Amino acid sequence: EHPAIWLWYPWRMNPEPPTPHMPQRRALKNVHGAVFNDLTPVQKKRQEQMLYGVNIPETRQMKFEEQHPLLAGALRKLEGQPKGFPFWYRKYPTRRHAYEYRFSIPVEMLDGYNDDVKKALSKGMMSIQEKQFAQEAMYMERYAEHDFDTTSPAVLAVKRALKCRVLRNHLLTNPHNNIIKTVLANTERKLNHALRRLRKVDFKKYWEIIRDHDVQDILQPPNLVTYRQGSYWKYDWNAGLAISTNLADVMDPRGLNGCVETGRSRSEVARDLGLSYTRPLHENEKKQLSHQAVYYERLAKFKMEQPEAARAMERERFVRKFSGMFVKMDIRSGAPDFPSTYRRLLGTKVVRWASKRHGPN
Amino acid sequence: HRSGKARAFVFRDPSLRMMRAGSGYQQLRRMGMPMQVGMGWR
Amino acid sequence: INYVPHAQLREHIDKELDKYVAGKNEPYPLNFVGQMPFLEDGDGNIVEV
Amino acid sequence: RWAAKFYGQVTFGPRNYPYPSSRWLARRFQMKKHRIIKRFRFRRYKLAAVANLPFAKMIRVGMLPELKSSKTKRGDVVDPTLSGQLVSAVKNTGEKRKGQRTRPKSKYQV
Amino acid sequence: GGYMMYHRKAMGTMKYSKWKGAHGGISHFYGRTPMVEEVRPNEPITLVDRRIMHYVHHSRLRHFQLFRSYQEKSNSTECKLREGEMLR
Amino acid sequence: IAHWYCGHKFRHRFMRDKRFHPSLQASHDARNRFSKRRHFKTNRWNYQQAYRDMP
Amino acid sequence: PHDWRHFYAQEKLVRERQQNGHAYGRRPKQFSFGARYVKTDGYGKRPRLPYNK
Amino acid sequence: LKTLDVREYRPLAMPIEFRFYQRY
Amino acid sequence: AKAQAIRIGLYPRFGNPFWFRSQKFRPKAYQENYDPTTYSTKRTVEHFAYNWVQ
Amino acid sequence: VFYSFVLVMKPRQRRFTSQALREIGVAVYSNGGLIRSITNEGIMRPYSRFRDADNTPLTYARYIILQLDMGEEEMGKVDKIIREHQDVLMALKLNNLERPVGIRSGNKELQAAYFPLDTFTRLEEEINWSPQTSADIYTQLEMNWKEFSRTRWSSFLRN
RNA sequence: AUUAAAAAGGUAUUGUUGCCCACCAAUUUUUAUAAUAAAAAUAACGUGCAGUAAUUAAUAUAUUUAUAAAAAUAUAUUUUUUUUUUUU
RNA sequence: UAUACAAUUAUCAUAUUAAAUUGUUAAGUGUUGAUUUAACCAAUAAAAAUAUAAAUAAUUUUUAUUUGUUUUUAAACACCAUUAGGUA
Ligand SMILES: [Mg+2]
Ligand SMILES: [Mg+2]
Ligand SMILES: [Mg+2]
Ligand SMILES: [Mg+2]
Ligand SMILES: [Mg+2]
Ligand SMILES: [Mg+2]
Ligand SMILES: [Mg+2]
Ligand SMILES: [Mg+2]
Ligand SMILES: [Mg+2]
Ligand SMILES: [Mg+2]
Ligand SMILES: [Mg+2]
Ligand SMILES: [Mg+2]
Ligand SMILES: [Mg+2]
Ligand SMILES: [Mg+2]
Ligand SMILES: [Mg+2]
Ligand SMILES: [Mg+2]
């Protein structure tokens, strides 16, 4: 009934627990303080798709056949027959690349052995840790720039995304291990770094990672204060990606620059070259502008068709100009910020304003 | 004395004390850094 | 390695369960704890100690 | 924790004194802490901090007109609804309901 | 109330008290028996006993058992005593 | 140190100077230097579903 | 043993860095003679790391 | 606390760790 | 090992069932030989005694 | 091995032992796993009396060794299946068989860094030695080494 | 015809007939007035005997208890005095 | 009244690169009774054992997360009160 009440008997070290009692099991926060009760349907889908099994994409078989047609030719002669020479080694450049069977055993190496052995090295026989490593290797391979790429942004972002999902559902099961709460939070932070570097490296991959693994919640700026000071945007300055755009493929640079000798802004030289840069507008700005564009037509119609009403309003304005506070424009009257430049009047003489600052300055 | 000021083990080299003072307020006033926005001395 | 398939199960279980049948002409194998355990006849009653 | 671990500076010894506190000093401050705590117990102090209120400012419930120990001093002025709710809280804190977690009880809590 | 076997009050003899477990032959102590000695023919059991007891005492087992089986002590005093012992 | 500024002790002066120290200044990492503790545990029981407009 | 305090310190430090550099001198809550088998599903049946509480 | 010393106690020992704490 | 063995019933909860058999494996040290490295202060003085008496 | 069990069982009439083992085996097959070896041992006298489902303490018990290849997910199911069976007194489980204690400690492995496939191929018997093993197997081992290494490729490259 | 030596602590300072600890009156003074406000000066009266390994060692946190120092229990710990199996 | 901390090592309260979390085992009856305690009083007494590897280093978690208080005695010990119970 109405706000919680902490009761503290001051001889005791701490208060008694509150009356409404709170939820019996503590909520699980993400790094920023937002609450997740359970995995989102997307992430859930990712783990259900990890659990039952992963697969190597036939993409790799394809590029293997187009790049090294000889080796693939050999393997194409030899199917089903036991091989003493591993022709397939180009298909699996790294230890990590072969996830379809345990212990990094490539598929075509199982040709001459027992079917029992084949079942014993299968996916179904993996531990859970092995399965995670499998999903990670598959995704790392799909976003990697070359075979041995690890440290690049896309790869990093993906592996950290996966690690994060794993830890999350883990915490869902067994509530208190705060070691892993902390490791989840740190992972989430390093993921935040990786993603914010991605969108300034290549943004479409950034997008499709967010859409695959459903992490938009760690890209949300933490709080209004530090955002208003532009320290959220200040990150990609520190990362050194701020100037990295390479415009010319997008955004023809001719109308982004101002004229040094003329003094005219970028909107001006854009005006002159007959170009329009304008961000897509929401309904706010559209209906404001479309309301403002028409002022003069409405006015012309008004003063043509209805002169008496107009003359009334004008009487009021004209006569107003003689009444009022200041009749003429001087430094005192023409002070853009009146309460600010005269603060010394605000309590006593001037009663209009109750505060000295209504704006940035 | 856990509650009290930290003391140096030895003195400080005076020469270094004078070397770290190069950009100090007096030298700045001599360089002319602060804007003169008021009447100042008569 | 000889993997016991589902087809061979009860046959293999019986081969292993008759391992000590309380008479043979050949010397008996020990345990994993290296003991000579009790010899049961058919149906697993303990005949010889 | 809410309350204070210590009262006054309990570790004052010379630098590199290889313990947090000496016996002497810690005994002095144990005395002062003892007196304060005993005062809290006998006067039957009660504090509260309510949600959606400034927290640093704690309503002192031990001074409330219903729960006030003294017959003389004017206690305090707290909102009628809020004070009713505080009284109900203090009252229903007292005894152990089974299935609830056992919490330490005392004479001076009532 | 229920006591452990090394407890003070463990095997009580009273009108209410009754000993617990199979007490003879194959017994309550079946796999719990710390020492076993087959008595050599024509050997008094006093040599046997004094051998066992010397053994336990010199290796500080009887120390330990006497110690822990009488009173409770917090893990701090136990640590303090054991590490003190070991440093001495 | 003139004795009238800040508290009656000396160390109060240096405790308010730590408020102006250059390498101690408030930024995106170190925030709410002056009252950290009034804002502590403030949102614990405030449940906010994070913002996702992308799948 | 107190003469060797520095030694023990080195060990406490270790158990702290395992805990994310937090609980110094902290140890697991002693549970009960049979905490594991007297507790229902959903409650901790074995003593956790102190930071894990 | 009592603002004065109830006991007149002067230890004469000067352990090198207490005095120079910059080096020990 | 001792843990597992115990819960499987292959080792007793107290006692050493192989105690006598194992004595071959332990270095039982005869009072008649002298190991120059011992923390035994008795053995040293015993051999000192012996030689002096010789 | 991937997994192993030691199963201490009540010494019943043979038809019952066979039914129970068929139940455990079928419980392993249904869950999509394999049996490397199901080894039988005799009715032994343990160091601890076990009580059965009748709460009647037992002096003797039949020992049975399981060696399985499963997923770690669905061996939870097989675990609480085995432990909940009425003819099993006790079951101890070894999961350490893929990385046992004596490997991968400060580059103890020469010419490889943690080759996992060494101990997977093997059965439990050669990872953990039984007491009867003597210096004699040091002989047999090598006749089974050399011999093997002679016939392997020739046997494999046949088909 | 039935022997002794060698390791040890002081809040005192010619040192236990040494010092000290709280409540219990007067007063003095500052204030952020909780049974009977808080804190600091203080030299009465009356209880005791809390502390100086100090008559069940002390110290810190926690919880309880109460003429008054304080006491009981749960943890850590020595600014407490030490007693010492390299497979028996 | 004004009139110059440290920056090589400083113990009470502003944490931060971390691998954990999860395991269903044990124990119980023969019979006529002075056990425990320095000493009292209530009054069946036996007991709850297994896990390493792996997790990469730093750069915007400080309104987030985190430092021995915990359902179930129809289960005990232990502790508190004293035969009535509390707690565990
Ligand atoms: Mg302005
Ligand atoms: Mg004013
Ligand atoms: Mg206390
Ligand atoms: Mg009872
Ligand atoms: Mg003095
Ligand atoms: Mg002295
Ligand atoms: Mg006054
Ligand atoms: Mg007063
Ligand atoms: Mg005394
Ligand atoms: Mg005392
Ligand atoms: Mg005392
Ligand atoms: Mg104390
Ligand atoms: Mg008292
Ligand atoms: Mg106390
Ligand atoms: Mg601090
Ligand atoms: Mg309870």
DSSP code string of chain D: --S-S-SS-S--SPTT-SSSS-HHHHHHHHHHHHHHHHHHHHTT--EEEETTS-SSS-EEGGGSTTT-S-SSS------HHHHHHHHHHHHHHSSPPBTBPP----GGG-
> Distance, angstroms, CA B35 to C1' L4?
27
For chain G, give the longest Cα–Cα distance.
46
Quick one: which of A2, A122, A156 has its CA closest to A54? Answer: A122
Q: What would the two tokens of residue D21 be?
A: 């506190």
Q: Which of these, A153, A157, A156, A187, lies nearest to A170 by C-alpha position?
A: A187
Please measure the distance between the N-terminal and C-terminal CA atoms of chain A and give it in whole angstroms.
Answer: 46
Cβ of G37 near strand L (distance < 7 A): yes
Q: How far is the CA of E38 from the C1' of K63 (A)?
A: 55
Q: Is the CB of A237 under 7 A from strand L?
A: yes
What are the CA-CA distances from residue B2 to residues E52, F17, F18 (Å)?
A: 58, 21, 19
E34 in reach of chain I (CB within 8 A): yes
State the distance between the two ends of chain I, measured CA to CA, in whole angstroms.
Answer: 51
Q: Which chains border I (3 or more CB–CB pairs < 8 Å)?
A: E, J
* Cα separation, A276 vs A280, whole angstroms: 12
Smallest CA–CA distance, residue D56 to chain F, in Å, is 7
Instruction: Tell me the CA–C1' distance in angstroms for E71 and L38.
Output: 17
Name the 3-class secondary structure at C11: helix
For residue J42, list chain C residues with Cβ-Cβ distance below 8 A: 19-20, 31, 35-40
For residue D50 the two structure tokens come to 């309510």
Q: How far is A16 from chain D (nearest CA, A)?
A: 8
CA-based nearest residue in chain C for residue A119: C3
Q: Give the distance (Å) from ligand 15 centre to CA of residue A174.
A: 34
Token code pair at residue A168: 């999350």
| Whole-angstrom distance, CA of residue J159 vs CA of residue J154 | 10
Could you tell me the distance, in angstroms and rounded to a whole number, from the CA of residue A356 to the centre of ligand 2?
10
Mutate to test the interface with I, among E26, E27, E36 (most CBs of I within 10 A): E36
Contact call for A179 and G48, based on CB within 8 A = no
CB count within 10 Å of CB A102 equals 21
**Among candidate residues J116, J27, J124, J17, the one with its CA nearest the CA of residue J67:** J124
Residues in chain I closer than 8 A to J124 (CB atoms): none
CA of J7 to C1' of L68 (A): 39
Query: How far is the alpha carbon of E84 from chain J, nearest alpha carbon, in Å?
Result: 33
For β-strands J50-51 and J57-58, DSSP reports them as: antiparallel
Å between A193 CA and L58 C1'?
12
How many angstroms separate the Cα of G48 from the Cα of each of A25, G20, G21?
Answer: 17, 15, 16
**CA E69 vs CA A258, E52, I13: distances in Å:** 90, 19, 17
Return the amino acid letter for A230.
G
Binding site annotation covers H21? no
Look up tokens 């006790």; give the residue. J90
Diameter over CA atoms, chain E? 49
CA distance A350 to A289: 37
Q: Is E21 left (phi over 0), alpha (psi -120 to 50) or beta?
A: left
Query: Which bases of chain L are under 7 A from a protein CB atom?
Result: 1-3, 5-31, 33-37, 42-73, 75-78, 87-88
Q: Using CB atoms, pick whichever of G1, G3, G27 lies closest to residue E80.
A: G1
- Which residues of E are less than 8 Å from G1 in CB distance? 80, 83-84, 87
Burial class (CB in 10 A: 0-12, 13-18, 19+), A357: exposed
Alpha helices in J1-158, H assignment, sequence order: 14-30, 75-82, 117-121, 124-127, 136-156
- Touching chains, G (3+ CB pairs < 8 A): A, E
Closest CA to E62 of E49, E43, E75, E79: E49
Report which of A28, E65, C6 is spatially closest to residue J29, judged by C-alpha positions: C6
Strand partners, I49: none
The tokens for J59 are 């002096």
Is residue J9 within 8 A of residue I8, CB to CB? The reply is no
Query: The tokens of E10 are what?
Result: 């463990």
J39 strand-pairing partners: J65
Chain D positions in Cβ-Cβ contact with residue H24 (cut-off 8 Å) = 16
Please check whether residue J36 is in contact with residue J47, taking contact to mean a CB–CB distance below 8 angstroms. Answer: no
Tell whether D6 lies on the interface with B, counting CB pairs under 8 A.
no
The protein residue nearest L53 (Cα–C1') is J99
Under the phi-then-psi rule, with left for phi > 0, alpha for psi from -120 to 50, and beta for the rest, what region is D99?
A: left
Compute the distance between CA of residue F51 and CA of residue A218 in angstroms, rounded to an integer. Answer: 9
Q: How far is CA A92 from the centre of its chain?
A: 34
| Rounded CA separation J34/C3 (Å) | 7
* Model resolution, angstroms: 7.8
CB pair distance less than 8 Å for I7 and J50 = no
Report how far Cα C2 is from the mean position of its chain's Cα atoms: 17
* CA–CA separation, J43 and C33 (whole Å): 12
| Cβ–Cβ under 8 Å, residues A132 and A165 | no
User: How far is CA E80 from each of CA E76, G3, G14, I50, rounded to the nearest angstrom?
Assistant: 6, 12, 20, 42
